[PDB]
């Protein structure tokens, strides 16, 4: 049949987990609110899921926001069928980079890059390329 799970898509830039929870708390109590986000950066994928304690409240929210024009986005709201619980939506942050350790010594890495240069020379000879050294 139908569950108490609401699938929302075509969400604007400012619509996130806290905004969705605050807006749909007026429709009803929310068990869980999640938003699809990129893994490497803290940017939404413009869709998410909410769970209502009352499936009647979920249906009312869907029939209220199914074709709502919001900041140039026509929001799309659906009621998920029976079962199919929501899972695996971690709230990612903007990941940072850092330089790690280099345990290979100077002599060993020079030998490795010399071996890679020799491998390149062998590949150039193999591929019918006549170049010096």
């Amino acid at each position: 049949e139908y569950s108490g799970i609401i699938y929302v898509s075509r969400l604007p830039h400012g619509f996130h987990e806290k905004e969705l929870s605050k807006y749909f708390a007026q429709f009803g109590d929310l068990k869980e609110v999640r938003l699809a986000r990129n893994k490497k950066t803290g940017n939404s994928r413009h869709y998410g899921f909410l769970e209502f304690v009352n499936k009647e409240d979920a249906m009312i929210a869907q029939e209220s926001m199914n074709n709502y024009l919001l900041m140039g986005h026509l929001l799309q709201v659906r009621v998920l069928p029976k079962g199919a619980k929501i899972e695996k939506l971690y709230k990612y942050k903007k990941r940072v980079l850092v330089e790690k350790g280099i345990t290979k010594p100077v002599k060993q890495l020079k030998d490795n890059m010399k071996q890679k240069h020799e491998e390149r020379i062998k590949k150039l000879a193999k591929s019918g390329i006549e170049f010096k050294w």
Partner: protein
């Protein structure tokens, strides 16, 4: 810096490699320079400002000359300030750049970018049709938010900051001189946050191999003083690389006024 005979032989071999007998027949003839640095070029902070490398031989004029027989012709976009868009017209550029054969197709501003091309699809369609994008150095800092991130995924669609103001006032002569200097002498290179720098030299049909040799020699001579480089490679698309430089010693580098103001404004 670079042996003349070695680089001439490499360029001739790579231009022989292309001529063995969609985009398959077109994308494979672009020369690329790979610069491998011991450290990151910028560091911990990203950079979108393209570095301008000066060479003796023109690069963009051959692009305009050879783009007449292509579906996507060479186009120039100019982005200037809203308060200074009224001081310049198409005829102002025509009568000052007609002798050099330099034509600026379209001049827009921030208001145009925020109103006419605000939508993503229209903005992409407008941006992708231009090859050389020049931007005022004052407004170039607002461009990542206005033009979007897709324009920064390619070298040609990344705007070039130019000096347009003389004596803190708008200068048509200075603007035209900067446009001419960029069009004739300098080439843009995108600085990554990694160790691999890619330089697009152009197309084999655009320039002679000796002119490519001169350009790459001057690029290497400038970049040796610019950075503590490690390796230099020359390649063509869908082809292997050929090294041209080697050094060792540069690898040896591998291994409260706010509270005072608060206290000043506070009683105790």
């Amino acid at each position: 810096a670079i042996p003349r005979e070695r680089v001439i032989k490499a360029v001739n071999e790579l231009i022989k490699f292309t001529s063995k007998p969609d985009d398959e027949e077109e994308l494979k003839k672009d020369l690329q320079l790979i610069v491998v640095n011991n450290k990151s070029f910028t560091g911990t902070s990203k950079s979108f400002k393209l570095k301008l490398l000066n060479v003796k031989h023109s690069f963009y004029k051959p692009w305009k000359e050879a783009s007449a027989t292509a579906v996507k012709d060479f186009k120039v976009l100019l982005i200037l300030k809203d308060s200074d868009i009224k001081k310049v017209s198409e005829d102002d550029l025509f009568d000052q750049l007609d002798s050099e054969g330099i034509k600026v197709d379209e001049i827009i501003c921030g208001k145009d970018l925020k109103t006419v091309y605000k939508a993503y699809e229209a903005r992409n369609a407008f941006i992708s049709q231009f090859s050389l994008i020049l931007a005022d150095d004052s407004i170039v800092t607002s461009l990542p938010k206005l033009m979007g991130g897709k324009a920064y995924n390619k070298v040609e669609t990344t705007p070039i900051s130019i000096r347009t103001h003389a004596n803190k006032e708008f200068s048509l002569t200075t603007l035209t001189n900067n446009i001419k200097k960029v069009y004739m002498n300098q080439l843009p290179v995108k600085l990554p946050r990694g160790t691999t720098l890619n330089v697009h030299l152009g197309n084999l049909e655009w320039l002679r191999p000796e002119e490519f040799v001169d350009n790459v020699e001057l690029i290497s001579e400038q970049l040796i003083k610019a950075y503590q480089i490690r390796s230099i490679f020359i390649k063509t698309n869908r082809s292997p690389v050929l090294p041209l430089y080697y050094n060792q010693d540069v690898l040896d580098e591998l291994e409260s006024t706010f509270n005072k103001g608060l206290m000043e404004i506070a009683n105790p």
